[PDB]
């Protein structure tokens, strides 16, 4: 796997109504699955956390659970997202980020592990200010943030600002974007680049 290190990885999966059910089924859920496939989930390597967010954040994989540390068990849970009322609602990225900060506050995370947030999103947050504020508070706790943008509703400048890059210029290893139909071709190289940054 291109991601293989002691990393607590918080997958924040946008489930907003802007996605459209057919994209959710054919692309978003398969994208999360392929993302997970880039990770060595193990007690001594990556531990996964996952939430979905639209109106609010909802945890779907508990950090350090069996599914957090085993890829087959993680993939069953992601696949279970198909048989739901998703997608729907707005884009409450700040509440999704807040849940990660609650893990840190509460000392749930491995203190020894690098802390990485990976956001999958097709839009702009409800509150750019609340999002960038949470993100700062995460950054102060040593958290790195990566963003994978999808489709025409994103704002690339905001995404790049979020991950700590210049909004337009220069290489940004913590950011990538893709058209809906192309996401599974962009995810592997993105996760390779992100994991290289996290390690360096
Ligand atoms: Cl928000």
Automatic annotation (TrEMBL):
Species of origin: Plasmodium falciparum (malaria parasite P. falciparum)
Protein name from the UniProt record: Thrombospondin related anonymous protein
Compartments in which it is found: Cell membrane; Membrane
Full protein segment contained here: 41 to 240 of 559
Residue positions binding Mg(2+) 1: 16, 18, 122
Segments forming domain VWFA: 8-194
Disulphide bonds in the chain: 3-195, 165-172
Binding positions for Mg(2+) 2 per the UniProt entry: 94, 130
């Amino acid at each position: 796997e291109v991601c293989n290190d002691e990393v607590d990885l918080y997958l924040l999966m946008d489930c907003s109504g802007s996605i459209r059910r057919h994209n959710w089924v054919k692309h978003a859920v398969p994208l999360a699955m392929k993302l997970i496939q880039q990770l060595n989930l193990n007690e001594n390597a990556i531990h996964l956390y996952a939430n979905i967010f639209s109106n609010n954040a909802k945890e779907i994989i508990r950090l350090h659970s069996d599914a957090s540390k085993n890829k087959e068990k993680a993939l069953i849970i992601i696949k279970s997202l198909l048989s739901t009322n998703l997608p729907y609602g707005r884009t409450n990225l700040s509440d999704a980020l807040l849940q990660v900060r609650k893990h840190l506050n509460d000392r749930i995370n491995r203190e020894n592990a690098n802390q990485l947030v990976v956001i999958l999103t097709d839009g702009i947050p409800d509150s750019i200010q609340d999002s960038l504020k949470e993100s700062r508070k995460l950054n102060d706790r040593g958290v790195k943030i990566a963003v994978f943008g999808i489709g025409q509703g994103i704002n690339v400048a905001f995404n790049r600002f979020l991950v700590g890059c210049h909004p337009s210029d220069g290489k940004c290893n913590l950011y990538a974007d893709s058209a809906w139909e192309n996401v599974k071709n962009v995810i592997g190289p993105f996760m390779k680049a992100v994991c290289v940054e996290v390690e360096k």
